[PDB]
Amino acid sequence: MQGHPEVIDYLNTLLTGELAARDQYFIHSRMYEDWGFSKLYERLNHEMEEETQHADALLRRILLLEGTPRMRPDDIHPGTTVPEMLEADLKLERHVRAALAKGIALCEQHKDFVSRDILKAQLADTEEDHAYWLEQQLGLIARMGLENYLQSQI
Amino acid sequence: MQGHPEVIDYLNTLLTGELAARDQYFIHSRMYEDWGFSKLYERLNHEMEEETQHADALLRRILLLEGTPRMRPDDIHPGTTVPEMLEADLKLERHVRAALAKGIALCEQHKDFVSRDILKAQLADTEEDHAYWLEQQLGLIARMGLENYLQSQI
Amino acid sequence: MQGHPEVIDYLNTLLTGELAARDQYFIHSRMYEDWGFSKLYERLNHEMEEETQHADALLRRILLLEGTPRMRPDDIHPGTTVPEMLEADLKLERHVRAALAKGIALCEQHKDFVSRDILKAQLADTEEDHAYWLEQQLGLIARMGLENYLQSQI
Amino acid sequence: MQGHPEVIDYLNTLLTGELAARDQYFIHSRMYEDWGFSKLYERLNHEMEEETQHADALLRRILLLEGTPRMRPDDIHPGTTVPEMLEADLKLERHVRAALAKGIALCEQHKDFVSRDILKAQLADTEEDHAYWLEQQLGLIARMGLENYLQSQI
Amino acid sequence: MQGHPEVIDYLNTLLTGELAARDQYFIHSRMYEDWGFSKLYERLNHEMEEETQHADALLRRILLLEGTPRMRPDDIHPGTTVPEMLEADLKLERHVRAALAKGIALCEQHKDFVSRDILKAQLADTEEDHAYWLEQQLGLIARMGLENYLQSQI
Amino acid sequence: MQGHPEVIDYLNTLLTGELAARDQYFIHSRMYEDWGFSKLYERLNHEMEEETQHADALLRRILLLEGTPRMRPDDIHPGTTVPEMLEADLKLERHVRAALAKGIALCEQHKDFVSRDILKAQLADTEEDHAYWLEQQLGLIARMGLENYLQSQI
Amino acid sequence: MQGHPEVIDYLNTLLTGELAARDQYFIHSRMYEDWGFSKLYERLNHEMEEETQHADALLRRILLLEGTPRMRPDDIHPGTTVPEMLEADLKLERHVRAALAKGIALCEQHKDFVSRDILKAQLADTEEDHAYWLEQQLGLIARMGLENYLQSQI
Amino acid sequence: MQGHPEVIDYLNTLLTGELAARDQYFIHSRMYEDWGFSKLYERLNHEMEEETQHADALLRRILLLEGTPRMRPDDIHPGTTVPEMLEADLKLERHVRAALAKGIALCEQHKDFVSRDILKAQLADTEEDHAYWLEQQLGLIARMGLENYLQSQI
Amino acid sequence: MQGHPEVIDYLNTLLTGELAARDQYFIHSRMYEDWGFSKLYERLNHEMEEETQHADALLRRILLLEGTPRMRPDDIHPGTTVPEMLEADLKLERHVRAALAKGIALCEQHKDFVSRDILKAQLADTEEDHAYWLEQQLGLIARMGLENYLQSQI
Amino acid sequence: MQGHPEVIDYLNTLLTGELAARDQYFIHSRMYEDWGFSKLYERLNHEMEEETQHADALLRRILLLEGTPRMRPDDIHPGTTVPEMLEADLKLERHVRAALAKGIALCEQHKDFVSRDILKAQLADTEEDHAYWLEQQLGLIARMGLENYLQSQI
Amino acid sequence: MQGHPEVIDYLNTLLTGELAARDQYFIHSRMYEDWGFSKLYERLNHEMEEETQHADALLRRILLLEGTPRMRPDDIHPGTTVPEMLEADLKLERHVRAALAKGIALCEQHKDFVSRDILKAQLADTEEDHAYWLEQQLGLIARMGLENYLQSQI
Amino acid sequence: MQGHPEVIDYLNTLLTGELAARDQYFIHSRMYEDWGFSKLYERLNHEMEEETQHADALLRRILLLEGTPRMRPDDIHPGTTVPEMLEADLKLERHVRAALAKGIALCEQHKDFVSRDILKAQLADTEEDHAYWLEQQLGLIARMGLENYLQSQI
Ligand SMILES: [Fe+3]
Ligand SMILES: [Fe+3]
Ligand SMILES: [Fe+3]
Ligand SMILES: [Fe+3]
Ligand SMILES: [Fe+3]
Ligand SMILES: [Fe+3]
Ligand SMILES: [Fe+3]
Ligand SMILES: [Fe+3]
Ligand SMILES: [Fe+3]
Ligand SMILES: [Fe+3]
Ligand SMILES: [Fe+3]
Ligand SMILES: [Fe+3]
Ligand SMILES: [Fe+3]
Ligand SMILES: [Fe+3]
Ligand SMILES: [Fe+3]
Ligand SMILES: [Fe+3]
Ligand SMILES: [Fe+3]
Ligand SMILES: [Fe+3]
Ligand SMILES: [Fe+3]
Ligand SMILES: [Fe+3]
Ligand SMILES: [Fe+3]
Ligand SMILES: [Fe+3]
Ligand SMILES: [Fe+3]
Ligand SMILES: [Fe+3]
Ligand SMILES: [Fe+3]
Ligand SMILES: [Fe+3]
Ligand SMILES: [Fe+3]
Ligand SMILES: [Fe+3]
Ligand SMILES: [Fe+3]
Ligand SMILES: [Fe+3]
Ligand SMILES: [Fe+3]
Ligand SMILES: [Fe+3]
Ligand SMILES: [Fe+3]
Ligand SMILES: [Fe+3]
Ligand SMILES: [Fe+3]
Ligand SMILES: [Fe+3]
Ligand code: NA
Ligand code: NA
Ligand code: NA
Ligand code: NA
């Protein structure tokens, strides 16, 4: 079934954003593991699997709409310390959030309600789970200090 | 069976106090969750269920005595930081404790011994579990400092 | 993540409406129990738990959006007979329904699609379960008469 | 295997009658549910599944006989109250009964004994279960009055 | 251990009251069974077992206090119709309630706190279960009429 | 609860479309079975059950909104060969898709968000499962030829 | 119990027809096995068991009616290729079908309704299972070609 | 549903025949038991249960057809020795067989095909099980002599 | 929470009494074991565990009230023969009983109802179990003589 | 532990090759699914998971050696038909094979035997499983033709 | 089978290194236990078992090659504080790593590929598990400070 | 994938060596069985299965490399007594060992690292299991004498 070219193009923009989120969590989770923070490894490894599923949903929708998926991830920007990595991932999730919300409005304007619903499901994941967890960690650092926080993530 | 109007009125005063305790623990438990302190969320969520049961016992007793329950909670006074919230809940429990003890004496004076027993059961919960746990947390903060304490409640 | 002040304020308006629905079902379910209608007690006790979950969803969303939840329930208006209580609860659910629908439109206008989805989930509960059950009971009373209906709810 | 054209045509007449019986029970069962009569919903939902199987048997037999099935249901005539719906379904079953009996005689005259047996199986269902249950409900209404009857079907 | 003679004598007064409550429920439960009201038989049979336990607690306490139990039940006053029997049992429970409350005050004045606690346990049973159930049945009769109520107790 | 007449009327238009989809899959699944293609029978039998559920959702929503459901299916247009039947079902699903999308926009304009959500759930089924499967079969025929495809569906 | 001589004689005619059907399926199933078509072996082996049961029913009925069974099978006419064998079995089943239908009419004319019912059970097997399966295979060959069909029966 | 008076009357004639068959097997089975032939007791006790089911089917059909069942059994004619009882039961079953066959023809002439099918089911039981077993026992007596036969039935 | 100094002091007086009861049962139970009376060892070992729990309840309550527990047991007065030990333990329990009852009155006068309830629970244990068992043993000795009694406690 | 810069750089070259292999299998597996070839979807989905593990091994080794992983995948070159995609994946695996073999020689020359072993494990996967499977599919197409091959992968 | 004398001698050099690693972990694990760090005891106890297996592999290989194992461990150099012990073990593992890598090159030059493989297996253990874990602990100390780190190892 | 001709040729040389080892163990194991040495039969039967797997690995690798396997086993040289057979098998394993080691060096020189790894796995089996077991048996004979050794292998 042929989708609207503007919707297909924008789904492709989101797809390359999700492939990048997957890859940023791939490097960050392994960096956390390398430093001995098993709880941060486990959380970010789990998020990497979740972004792979987000990407998969977009990729499959683009194919169903007879589009050609764009498979190059956006460039990523890993941190070099725990606070920088948490900040970098939060910036990433805020960008995804804004990009999804623009896509939701676009899908409504092109009367593609199934694509809109796919994006809204990911927006809820982005706001209520991914970004929220990151905000919580930065807030825990602010309240107990970085050293106590890092001890809790061994 | 028609209860004594003074006892019914005082049970209503206690009921609105218990509905408020339930609601203060509702907001505090969710604030703790929002900040990433799962152990404080779990404890205060559990206390919210316990105050709902305390309220239920009073509400049912008022109806059995052919009274009309007052269902508006007392106003609550949530804190804005972990130490303020613990303090606010302790002040709340101390007020409940005093209110229950006055009610126990009142029920005895009106020879309503079943109502008295209902209140004494809640007084033991208030003193030996609710208030006691809060005193313990504030004492833990005093002994290990706030930052170490907050780390323990993740 | 900072939500739009108008959306946060309106979520707070809905929250105090849900806290009230919880409390109206608390008093009504216990009144039904007091009169020996176990089936009405069980149904309204279950709805009280459902409104507590509705309130919880709004409260958590307000906190996630960096708002301060308003915890005072709206005033409630319990009935004094079975038909009055059913009517009062239906009036309550119709008001909730209208309030949610206005909030859904508001969330769309502020491009807060996750908040909109939270409200739409509650709107479906309100229309297809809560209000619907109440309409059914009043219709059963109309068809078999009040006395036969009350016998069926022992 | 090529069936007799008169038998195929008459099986088609019965098929559109069975598709209609299925659809009348579809609307009636959901109307009963909408009014809170779960026992009438369950019974008529079950009959809707039984008429779907009756239709299926006729449809498959028509295809086996190298006929082309007629898939438009006959028009249906739903009631607007419980007594009218029971009456309308009984009128429907009486019509089906007569139509099946004519078909049984026709199949014998064309020496199509397998088609005859298919119809006789449905005739027994129609007389001994479908129509019989409806006669029983109308008789229960006559003996205990409509209001007591409707109470029994909640 | 020698109890206070006034307390022992009053426990004996209560014991003969409990033996009577047991016997009134014995005759009423069997009358209900004789008329075909299995639910009233089961409830009053259960209450007869509960009053036997109440009597047993008093009898054992009197012996422990080196008193001689009085074993003649008070005279009972069975009804002749369902409404009269419910009324007669409610009058019985109201009398027990008042007698227990006087005994509680007496035990306190003689500093016999264990006897007081035994009586308070029975007072809660009397008010919150025995008398309450009877009030509920009479209220159900008032709301749905006697005939519908009796049908519900088959 | 009284729905908007334009929304009720349009839900009725969709209902007769879903009843037709159910019936087209009823005849097609049995035709496939008659020819020995058990895999096509099983798939289309399953879709017939899915369209019955789609119809049921619309029918129930119309009743809840105090409308009168229209129960006559739209006319159907069965094929006479496997490729024609697949094509006819795809044309059917494309029509359903367009009709649902118009209804979604209509429900939004009348601020009936629960009806809108019911339609969006069916739109996702229509696009991502029903129509998609049919497109896949026609594409398999194009890639391996009809004869090899039909062999795979025995 | 002495049956009618014309009915006994005709049952014997059918018995020798069923013994032949058993034997034609015996040779065909083993020929299919010899060529490597396990699915055709399994199907025709199963039909051979079914014809043995058909023969058994006739043989037992003839004995019950005090007749002497004729045990020589009719001559059979096996094919030499898969299409010829399917055709030969279909011709066989069409002959059985016609012979059974004549016997059904004969049994009715001699008021032997139990014999008639035995024949009608076999007629349904013959039309709806045995002949139908063979028609389906020939139709599959027509639709996908012989080579693809034979591959599917390995 | 009102049956044809001639069919109802004839079903009543059959019903009194089946009630008699039940009663003849009641006395015969107990006579066999009294003499120590447990195998004949068990067989005839089982047949008595089967005739009770035959009677039940006729009785229920007569009521469904709005007839009044005739409940007096036909007179029975028990034997006084094992060979006489077997003979008497065979004569009974032959009479039932003939009566059922006449009823089958009558039901067809009045186009009551469900009643006809009820009778045909009983006719098969009568011919293939009840009468057949009795013929077998008499034949066993003829082949091994009465004394050896009776030994086998201990 | 700061308790009343007079209540704390009196709880301390009771605590040292309970620590002594524990220790008197420790020596007596082991003396009984040393002489071969396993049943007296088991009973007094069990009472020693019960007094340890009584002491624990008082100790914990004193700490909760911000008092400093007094941990020196009162002096104990073990017997030298079975009758002397039973007598010594009964004297001990009578003293505990009186001390608890005075404490109950004191707690009421200082409106410390939770402390009062703790004491009343122990008073019931003291009267109805500990002292009662001892009275029973001395009474058994009086009724069967010491030698028969001691034989029963091996 | 600081690795040799030339080895770290070459591991990074391999890592971006493995991230690309993962992504080419991501798009190809979903394209196969979109066309209805479930067996090709399952195989390539499984290979995508295997390349993710290959990438993970390299990424972790680079971090252990105190290098900074390069996370941008190499560009990929998806096909547009089944034969092109198989060819494109085989070209990809041949390139990986050659790149790994060069890396193995490099690791030996820098006496990094653990890195060498990591690469040799992946080389065996590449040659004996990934590339081999692709060669097999192309060979199956050559032997049975593309259409028969594609039928086998439904 | 006679091994090369230079390879046997070098395996002996490695064996005495592994016996020493076992013994250094023996003393360190017990020192950690003595200080109350159960997690460091468990880890180093596990490494002591792993070095015993490394030694065993070398010892067995030397015997298989008809060499005489050297069983004196190299001298060890335990630390006196947690940071010194971690450092001392890391220095030990770095020395083992270098010694193994030299042995791998030596085995290749003498074409003893099985001995080489034994050493490479231990080299991977040394680099990727033993040394890596130690680097991680020192890095955790650097990031959260020694005191927080030691608390985490209780 | 086309392997290097020199590597393929040498793998073929090894393959015919492994086929011979399989066959020498086939004859030796059966000779041991024939003489009553079940333990030698079981061991050499197991080695025959192991050499079949070694051959299989080489054969499959040669095919993967697009070579043509040479399937003639090398000539074998069975012994005629237990000591001769053990010696002959040890000579065989020493030859295999040397042949594998030459092949390992050859594979490295042609940069075929997967083939090298296949050979190294077999070299470890040859040295550490096959040859080692044989050396052990000859050494056991030297230490306890042949007669005692043979007794141990019954
Ligand atoms: Fe998750
Ligand atoms: Fe995402
Ligand atoms: Fe995300
Ligand atoms: Fe608790
Ligand atoms: Fe409370
Ligand atoms: Fe509280
Ligand atoms: Fe619910
Ligand atoms: Fe709500
Ligand atoms: Fe609600
Ligand atoms: Fe049924
Ligand atoms: Fe039907
Ligand atoms: Fe019907
Ligand atoms: Fe009870
Ligand atoms: Fe009582
Ligand atoms: Fe009572
Ligand atoms: Fe599905
Ligand atoms: Fe649909
Ligand atoms: Fe559809
Ligand atoms: Fe079959
Ligand atoms: Fe047959
Ligand atoms: Fe047949
Ligand atoms: Fe039977
Ligand atoms: Fe019968
Ligand atoms: Fe019979
Ligand atoms: Fe005890
Ligand atoms: Fe005590
Ligand atoms: Fe005590
Ligand atoms: Fe794999
Ligand atoms: Fe790879
Ligand atoms: Fe690969
Ligand atoms: Fe390990
Ligand atoms: Fe080591
Ligand atoms: Fe090590
Ligand atoms: Fe082995
Ligand atoms: Fe080998
Ligand atoms: Fe070998
Ligand atoms: Na700390
Ligand atoms: Na009634
Ligand atoms: Na083909
Ligand atoms: Na004999």
Curated annotation (Swiss-Prot), chains A, B, C, D, E, F, G, H, I, J, K, L:
Q: Name one Pfam family in it.
A: Ferritin
Q: Which residues bind Fe(3+) C?
A: H46, E50
What GO molecular function annotations does the UniProt record carry, in alphabetical order? ferric iron binding; ferroxidase activity; heme binding; iron ion binding; iron ion sequestering activity
Q: Which reaction does it catalyse?
A: 4 Fe(2+) + O2 + 4 H(+) = 4 Fe(3+) + 2 H2O; Fe(2+)(in) = Fe(2+)(out)
| Positions bound to Fe(3+) B | E51, E93, H130
What is the deletion mutant like?
Produces about half the wild-type levels of catalase A in strain PAO1 (katA), slight increase in sensitivity to H(2)O(2), a double katA-ftnA deletion is more sensitive to H(2)O(2). When grown in iron-limiting conditions is less sensitive to H(2)O(2). BFR complexes are composed only of BfrB.
Query: Does the entry feature the keyword Transport, yes or no?
Result: yes
One GO process term, biological-process aspect: intracellular iron ion homeostasis
**InterPro entries on file:** Bacterioferritin, Ferritin-like, Ferritin-like_diiron, Ferritin-like_SF, Ferritin_DPS_dom
Q: Where in the cell is it found?
A: Cytoplasm
UniProt-annotated binding residues for Fe(3+) E: E50, D129
Q: What is its main location?
A: cytoplasm
Induction per the UniProt record: Transcription is up-regulated by FeCl(3) and H(2)O(2).
EC number(s) on file? 1.16.3.1
Q: Where does Fe(3+) D bind?
A: E47, E50, D129
Residues marked Dual function in ferroxidase center and iron gate (site): H130
| Domain (Ferritin-like diiron): residue spans on this chain | 1-145
For this UniProt record, give its keywords in alphabetical order, as a comma-separated list: Cytoplasm, Ion transport, Iron, Iron storage, Iron transport, Metal-binding, Oxidoreductase, Transport
Q: Does the keyword Hydrolase apply?
A: no
Q: Which residues bind Fe(3+) A?
A: E18, E51, H54
Instruction: Describe the protein's quaternary organization and the partners it interacts with.
Output: The bacterioferritin (BFR) complex is formed of 24 subunits (FtnA and BfrB) arranged as 12 homodimers. The holocomplex contains about 8.7% Fe and 8.0% phosphate. In vivo purifies with BfrB in varying ratios, depending on the O(2) content; as O(2) decreases FtnA content rises. Pure FtnA BFR complexes are not isolated in situ, although in a bfrB deletion some iron will accumulate in FtnA ferritin complexes.
Q: What does this protein do?
A: Plays a role in catalase A (katA) expression; activity is required for optimal KatA activity and resistance to H(2)O(2). Iron-storage protein that is part of the heterooligomeric bacterioferritin (BFR) complex. The ferroxidase center binds Fe(2+), oxidizes it using dioxygen to Fe(3+), and participates in subsequent Fe(3+) oxide mineral core formation within the central cavity of the BFR protein shell. Can store up to 520 iron atoms per ferritin protein molecule. Iron release requires only the input of electrons from ferredoxin NADP reductase (FPR), does not require Bfd. Does not bind heme.
The Swiss-Prot or TrEMBL record describes its family as follows: Belongs to the bacterioferritin family.
The protein's name:
Bacterial ferritin
Source organism (scientific name): Pseudomonas aeruginosa (strain ATCC 15692 / DSM 22644 / CIP 104116 / JCM 14847 / LMG 12228 / 1C / PRS 101 / PAO1)
What gene codes for this chain? ftnA
